[PDB]
PDB file of C-alpha atoms and ligand atoms in Angstrom:
ATOM      1  CA  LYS A1036     -65.859  17.089-174.595  1.00 22.52           C
ATOM      2  CA  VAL A1037     -63.168  18.670-172.430  1.00 24.45           C
ATOM      3  CA  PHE A1038     -61.930  21.667-174.386  1.00 20.29           C
ATOM      4  CA  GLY A1039     -58.418  22.972-174.377  1.00 15.84           C
ATOM      5  CA  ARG A1040     -57.985  26.571-173.264  1.00 14.04           C
ATOM      6  CA  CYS A1041     -57.066  27.937-176.704  1.00 15.24           C
ATOM      7  CA  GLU A1042     -59.331  25.400-178.441  1.00 15.00           C
ATOM      8  CA  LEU A1043     -62.332  26.830-176.568  1.00 13.67           C
ATOM      9  CA  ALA A1044     -61.185  30.407-177.184  1.00 11.75           C
ATOM     10  CA  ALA A1045     -61.144  29.658-180.901  1.00  9.00           C
ATOM     11  CA  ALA A1046     -64.572  28.009-180.782  1.00  7.15           C
ATOM     12  CA  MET A1047     -66.122  30.940-178.908  1.00  7.00           C
ATOM     13  CA  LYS A1048     -64.498  33.384-181.340  1.00  8.56           C
ATOM     14  CA  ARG A1049     -65.833  31.506-184.372  1.00  9.92           C
ATOM     15  CA  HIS A1050     -69.350  31.608-182.893  1.00 10.34           C
ATOM     16  CA  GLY A1051     -69.216  35.378-182.406  1.00  8.33           C
ATOM     17  CA  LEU A1052     -68.630  35.550-178.646  1.00  6.66           C
ATOM     18  CA  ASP A1053     -65.462  37.625-178.686  1.00  5.71           C
ATOM     19  CA  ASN A1054     -66.276  41.229-177.754  1.00  6.16           C
ATOM     20  CA  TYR A1055     -69.961  40.264-177.521  1.00  5.47           C
ATOM     21  CA  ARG A1056     -71.884  42.815-175.439  1.00  5.16           C
ATOM     22  CA  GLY A1057     -68.379  44.227-174.917  1.00  3.13           C
ATOM     23  CA  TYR A1058     -66.962  41.169-173.126  1.00  4.67           C
ATOM     24  CA  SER A1059     -63.513  40.183-174.363  1.00  6.34           C
ATOM     25  CA  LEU A1060     -62.782  36.580-175.294  1.00  7.43           C
ATOM     26  CA  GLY A1061     -60.788  36.161-172.085  1.00  7.40           C
ATOM     27  CA  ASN A1062     -63.893  36.897-170.031  1.00  7.25           C
ATOM     28  CA  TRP A1063     -65.780  34.089-171.771  1.00  8.52           C
ATOM     29  CA  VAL A1064     -62.927  31.580-171.472  1.00  7.08           C
ATOM     30  CA  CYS A1065     -62.457  32.468-167.812  1.00  6.98           C
ATOM     31  CA  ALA A1066     -66.191  32.026-167.131  1.00  2.50           C
ATOM     32  CA  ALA A1067     -66.170  28.596-168.809  1.00  2.77           C
ATOM     33  CA  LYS A1068     -63.056  27.595-166.824  1.00  5.44           C
ATOM     34  CA  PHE A1069     -64.782  28.174-163.505  1.00  7.31           C
ATOM     35  CA  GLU A1070     -68.304  27.119-164.510  1.00  7.16           C
ATOM     36  CA  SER A1071     -67.466  23.810-166.206  1.00  4.61           C
ATOM     37  CA  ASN A1072     -63.664  23.396-166.278  1.00  2.30           C
ATOM     38  CA  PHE A1073     -64.176  23.436-170.071  1.00  5.30           C
ATOM     39  CA  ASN A1074     -66.334  20.282-169.972  1.00  6.54           C
ATOM     40  CA  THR A1075     -69.350  20.460-172.278  1.00  5.30           C
ATOM     41  CA  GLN A1076     -71.066  17.657-170.310  1.00  4.45           C
ATOM     42  CA  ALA A1077     -70.937  19.388-166.918  1.00  5.20           C
ATOM     43  CA  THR A1078     -74.193  19.491-164.951  1.00  2.27           C
ATOM     44  CA  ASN A1079     -74.730  20.678-161.389  1.00  2.00           C
ATOM     45  CA  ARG A1080     -77.953  20.750-159.392  1.00  2.00           C
ATOM     46  CA  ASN A1081     -78.941  23.962-157.621  1.00  2.00           C
ATOM     47  CA  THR A1082     -80.497  24.117-154.162  1.00  2.00           C
ATOM     48  CA  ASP A1083     -83.793  25.378-155.618  1.00  2.00           C
ATOM     49  CA  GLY A1084     -84.172  22.291-157.816  1.00  2.00           C
ATOM     50  CA  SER A1085     -82.984  23.884-161.044  1.00  2.00           C
ATOM     51  CA  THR A1086     -79.928  22.558-162.878  1.00  2.00           C
ATOM     52  CA  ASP A1087     -77.013  24.270-164.628  1.00  2.00           C
ATOM     53  CA  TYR A1088     -75.992  22.751-167.969  1.00  2.00           C
ATOM     54  CA  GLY A1089     -72.856  22.800-170.045  1.00  2.00           C
ATOM     55  CA  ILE A1090     -69.687  24.754-170.734  1.00  2.00           C
ATOM     56  CA  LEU A1091     -71.333  27.886-169.313  1.00  2.00           C
ATOM     57  CA  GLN A1092     -73.681  26.259-166.760  1.00  2.00           C
ATOM     58  CA  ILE A1093     -76.887  27.734-168.129  1.00  2.00           C
ATOM     59  CA  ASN A1094     -79.719  27.450-165.596  1.00  2.00           C
ATOM     60  CA  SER A1095     -82.952  25.597-166.264  1.00  2.00           C
ATOM     61  CA  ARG A1096     -84.694  28.144-164.000  1.00  2.00           C
ATOM     62  CA  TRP A1097     -84.860  30.599-166.912  1.00  2.00           C
ATOM     63  CA  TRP A1098     -83.103  29.519-170.069  1.00  2.00           C
ATOM     64  CA  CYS A1099     -83.574  25.860-171.060  1.00  2.00           C
ATOM     65  CA  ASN A1100     -86.217  23.188-170.469  1.00  2.00           C
ATOM     66  CA  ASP A1101     -85.202  20.081-168.548  1.00  2.00           C
ATOM     67  CA  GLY A1102     -88.786  19.141-167.685  1.00  2.00           C
ATOM     68  CA  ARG A1103     -88.086  19.034-163.951  1.00  2.00           C
ATOM     69  CA  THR A1104     -87.707  22.701-162.893  1.00  2.00           C
ATOM     70  CA  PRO A1105     -91.231  23.701-161.781  1.00  2.00           C
ATOM     71  CA  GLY A1106     -92.200  27.247-162.738  1.00  2.00           C
ATOM     72  CA  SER A1107     -89.178  27.758-164.979  1.00  2.00           C
ATOM     73  CA  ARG A1108     -89.082  29.434-168.376  1.00  2.00           C
ATOM     74  CA  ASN A1109     -87.250  28.283-171.518  1.00  2.00           C
ATOM     75  CA  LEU A1110     -86.157  31.673-172.834  1.00  2.00           C
ATOM     76  CA  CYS A1111     -83.514  30.163-175.103  1.00  2.00           C
ATOM     77  CA  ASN A1112     -86.194  27.720-176.369  1.00  2.00           C
ATOM     78  CA  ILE A1113     -83.917  24.683-176.203  1.00  2.00           C
ATOM     79  CA  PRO A1114     -83.842  21.400-174.279  1.00  2.00           C
ATOM     80  CA  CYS A1115     -81.222  21.675-171.567  1.00  2.00           C
ATOM     81  CA  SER A1116     -79.564  18.542-172.962  1.00  2.00           C
ATOM     82  CA  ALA A1117     -78.658  20.463-176.146  1.00  2.00           C
ATOM     83  CA  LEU A1118     -76.412  22.595-173.905  1.00  2.00           C
ATOM     84  CA  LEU A1119     -74.244  19.495-173.316  1.00  2.00           C
ATOM     85  CA  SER A1120     -73.192  18.885-176.935  1.00  2.00           C
ATOM     86  CA  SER A1121     -69.558  18.849-178.012  1.00  2.00           C
ATOM     87  CA  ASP A1122     -70.581  21.550-180.503  1.00  2.00           C
ATOM     88  CA  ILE A1123     -70.967  24.720-178.417  1.00  2.00           C
ATOM     89  CA  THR A1124     -73.316  26.486-180.828  1.00  2.00           C
ATOM     90  CA  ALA A1125     -76.444  26.228-178.657  1.00  2.00           C
ATOM     91  CA  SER A1126     -74.569  27.254-175.509  1.00  2.00           C
ATOM     92  CA  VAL A1127     -73.152  30.320-177.283  1.00  2.00           C
ATOM     93  CA  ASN A1128     -76.527  31.359-178.700  1.00  2.00           C
ATOM     94  CA  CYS A1129     -78.130  31.095-175.264  1.00  2.00           C
ATOM     95  CA  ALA A1130     -75.227  32.849-173.516  1.00  2.00           C
ATOM     96  CA  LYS A1131     -75.629  35.797-175.911  1.00  2.00           C
ATOM     97  CA  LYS A1132     -79.224  36.045-174.707  1.00  2.00           C
ATOM     98  CA  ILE A1133     -78.276  35.701-171.030  1.00  2.00           C
ATOM     99  CA  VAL A1134     -75.542  38.340-171.181  1.00  2.00           C
ATOM    100  CA  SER A1135     -77.956  40.724-172.965  1.00  2.00           C
ATOM    101  CA  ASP A1136     -80.600  40.313-170.250  1.00  2.00           C
ATOM    102  CA  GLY A1137     -79.465  43.424-168.364  1.00  2.00           C
ATOM    103  CA  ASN A1138     -76.711  42.506-165.887  1.00  2.00           C
ATOM    104  CA  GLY A1139     -73.976  41.533-168.347  1.00  2.00           C
ATOM    105  CA  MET A1140     -71.756  38.639-167.327  1.00  2.00           C
ATOM    106  CA  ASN A1141     -72.785  39.080-163.684  1.00  2.00           C
ATOM    107  CA  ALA A1142     -75.443  36.482-164.503  1.00  2.00           C
ATOM    108  CA  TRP A1143     -72.570  33.990-164.098  1.00  2.00           C
ATOM    109  CA  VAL A1144     -71.885  34.072-160.353  1.00  2.00           C
ATOM    110  CA  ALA A1145     -68.538  32.329-160.941  1.00  2.00           C
ATOM    111  CA  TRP A1146     -67.564  35.011-163.480  1.00  2.00           C
ATOM    112  CA  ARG A1147     -68.456  37.706-160.964  1.00  2.00           C
ATOM    113  CA  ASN A1148     -66.515  36.141-158.119  1.00  2.00           C
ATOM    114  CA  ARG A1149     -63.519  34.703-160.014  1.00  2.00           C
ATOM    115  CA  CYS A1150     -63.071  36.525-163.342  1.00  2.00           C
ATOM    116  CA  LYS A1151     -64.522  40.031-163.051  1.00  2.00           C
ATOM    117  CA  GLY A1152     -61.761  42.630-162.829  1.00  2.00           C
ATOM    118  CA  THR A1153     -58.948  40.066-163.118  1.00  2.00           C
ATOM    119  CA  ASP A1154     -56.385  39.787-165.937  1.00  2.00           C
ATOM    120  CA  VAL A1155     -58.743  37.797-168.163  1.00  2.00           C
ATOM    121  CA  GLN A1156     -56.449  38.264-171.185  1.00  2.00           C
ATOM    122  CA  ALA A1157     -54.235  35.627-169.568  1.00  2.00           C
ATOM    123  CA  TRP A1158     -56.905  33.088-170.498  1.00  2.00           C
ATOM    124  CA  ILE A1159     -56.239  33.696-174.211  1.00  2.00           C
ATOM    125  CA  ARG A1160     -52.475  34.210-173.856  1.00  2.00           C
ATOM    126  CA  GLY A1161     -50.499  32.268-176.446  1.00  2.00           C
ATOM    127  CA  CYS A1162     -53.615  31.325-178.448  1.00  2.00           C
ATOM    128  CA  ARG A1163     -53.481  31.538-182.241  1.00  2.00           C
TER     129      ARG A1163
HETATM  130 CL1  LIG B2028     -72.239  44.974-169.356  1.00  2.00          CL
HETATM  131 NA1  LIG B2029     -86.886  25.658-167.591  1.00  2.00          NA
END
């Protein structure tokens, strides 16, 4: 599923992401823009052999099990494939755990380099 900008904002808000760990909805929509271009089916392999999965590109190195990342953990206790569903519930639940892990949204390198400190409210501008 390729979400619309305000469609995804509304889905994140309904799953309790807005203001979560103090990160406004625009921060989450911006992160998803640059991680997945709003595509729930996005996957990208990392140089170390782990893979990032879904709307928020959650890494198999720590958070989901894809069965092919040696030495990884599954701290969200989910198959990585469940992070590719059109329903974003699993991705939100796991992102809440990631963003609580200590470094906030800096866990998302694309958030740090492309959203952090910018006018993230623009990402939810015009959304109902
Ligand atoms: Cl923080
Ligand atoms: Na893993």
